[model samples]
Target: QLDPATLAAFSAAFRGELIWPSDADYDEARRIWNGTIDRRPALIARCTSTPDVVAAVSFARKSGLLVAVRGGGHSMAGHSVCDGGIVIDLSLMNSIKVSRRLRRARAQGGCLLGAFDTATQAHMLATPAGVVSHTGLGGLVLGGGFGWLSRKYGLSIDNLTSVEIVTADGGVLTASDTENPDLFWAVRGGGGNFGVVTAFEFDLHRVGPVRFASTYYSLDEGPQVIRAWRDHMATAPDELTWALYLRLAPPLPELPADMHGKPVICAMSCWIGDPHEGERQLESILHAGKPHGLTKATLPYRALQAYSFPGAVVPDRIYTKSGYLNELSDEATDTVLEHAADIASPFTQLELLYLGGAVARVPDDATAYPNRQSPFVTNLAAAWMDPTEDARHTAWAREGYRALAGHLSGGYVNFMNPGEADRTREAYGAAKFERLQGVKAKYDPTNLFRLNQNIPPS
Candidate 1:
């Protein structure tokens, strides 16, 4: 246990609110996105400044206290908080600044995707990011972020210009192409192995008010429609971003009650180029599938960006297994289709995202993110409200991954589940893994930040 005198000195140096286990806000402070995670940290330091983070990190290190850093707290792997550890909570640092003339945005470490979009969209400018609005910007960037705008612009890391990060030794450093270049390279896809990022600066582009098309097909017709859609996107324009999902049909008025609880395929896409051309391209997809229900509109980028997975419940037990398919071969397609039909829980989803366009155009070595040429990204995810069904839900996800494992190479680090941290090497190839370790040696040799997809100094 930390002595009273030592704790008092550290608290005196800290500039933010330090909540102890007995504090009124302790429970709320320890909670994160996945309801399945129930960690109880000894202390929660709600950081409001870089200096506060510095104090928190230094205190945790000097006192040999386990530390977890919270950004947006939407931890798919539940790495944002740790039991009997200290949490450097950055939620209070939410702030953003934009430069219209330069087409740039700077967001605080705690900023969420929705806040970033809202801030930049005000100037009709945006940077590519995750599809989920509430995902933390810091963690997403570190893990190589992407969303609908990624095809038109690029992955979130590709747009990042710089970051203000506090390293393990309590030093604030700016990482970019011209400063701490090695750290910058590693951080682009390093998965929080380096330090606590205090701020991020990104280049922005004109986006939004895009053409969106959604077409739903019965499971009976899913195979052909999915194959056609995949082949079509293989040649689609760079401005078009699309996703295909195999899941239970939602009970919307547009769909009859008979279709509810039944398996279906939804082909959803957004076009950020000329609205006229976008509409035309979307028509091709709508016609490719025999649609039971459809929705097409010209919507603001923020509105579409904020859209969550259909029928997803919040604060639930969520487990995900993600992989990148070099090609959506017939075998892989059949494997995915089978899982969708036998979907264990209504909340479970099989998501297929077509990746190419600007994201692929970037050189593979330009950033640490791998599988740049992979055509398909699949996430077999299970989110249920029942705690007792953990084994059923997790087993289903494992089965889904095992069925399609033969066709996969690499994966999305951000989508990793709670216990998949060891796949860090698989996520990043051997050569890159060693290189990342070198950076870890330079910045965090002792691996003080081990909660994330840890890249310990070797």
Candidate 2:
């Protein structure tokens, strides 16, 4: 149990709310995106400034308490919250500032993708970010962020200019190419093991009014559609981004009511260029066969980013497994289709994201992010509301990846399932992983920040 006098002393130093179990919002404060995570911290320091974070970090260390830093609270691995510890919550620090002259944007670590995009898009400028708008920019960028704009621009870290972080030592530091360059490299895609990043500065780009095209085909045509998408993306320009998703058709105005809740092969693309050019480039896949339905529209960048996923909210339980694919071999294609056809949960879906163009142009060693040369990244996401079916959903994802294991070049660290600690080292190869460890030793030798996809000091 926490001492009331000690807690009050720390509260005096912190400028934010000091929530305890007795507080009215304690339950809501402790909840995260993944319903499976039910951790309750002894104290939730809803931090609102850099000083608040530093004070909390110092207090946690002084009291020998486990510390969990929460930014967007979207860790697929549920590392954002912890039981019987002190949580330095950054949810209230959401702020954004843009520079039109410099074409840059600086956002607080608490800023969500939707709000960040809305702020930047107002100036007709944006930075590459996650597909889901509600995703935390901190976790997304630090874990090698990708989205519809990634194929055109680079990953979010590629546009990152600098970051203001509070290290495990309770000291504030700035990381960039010129300042604390080593820490900057480590933070680019190294996850949040290095420090508590308070703010991020990104080099913005001109983007808006993208041409979006979406269509769905019968499940029987999965193989044909997958192959067509794979072949077309081989030479697709950087201006176009696409993905082939295996999902259950939702009951929406764009799709037939009869086809709702049925398994289907969906292909979606966005072109950051002229509408006419986008139409011509998309014709091959759009006209491949008689689709269940087709939808096309030109939407502003923010509108497209905020468009909700059909018939789903922040799920209570989600198990996602992802890996990079170097080739879509015939055998690999068949294995993926088989799993898609046998999905146990209606919420479970398989997505093959096209990865080339600007994403591949970056050298593998250019940043902490690995897997730049891989042509595709596959995500097998299993989500359900009931706790009893957890094992079934997780088993399906694991089995699906095992079947296509040979085709996988590597796995994306951001989409990893919880308790897969063994795969963490493999995500970044030995050399890069070692380098990350060296940085970890320098800033956090005792491993104070071990709550994330941890990189040990040893």
Each prediction's Cα RMSD? 1.3, 1.4
Tens digits of per-residue lDDT for model 2 on 182-242?
A: 9999999899999899999999988868888778888887777888888888987888887
Per-residue alpha-carbon lDDT of model 1 for 114-181, expressed as tens digits? 99999999999989998888888889989899888888788999999999999999999999999999
Q: Which regions in candidate 2 have their CA more than 4 angstroms from the true location?
A: 3-6
List the candidates' TM-scores in order. Answer: 0.98, 0.97
For model 2, give the 10-residue run with minimal summed lDDT: 307-316
Indicate the residue-level lDDT of 290 in model 1.
74
User: Which runs in model 1 stand beyond 4 Å of their true positions?
Assistant: none
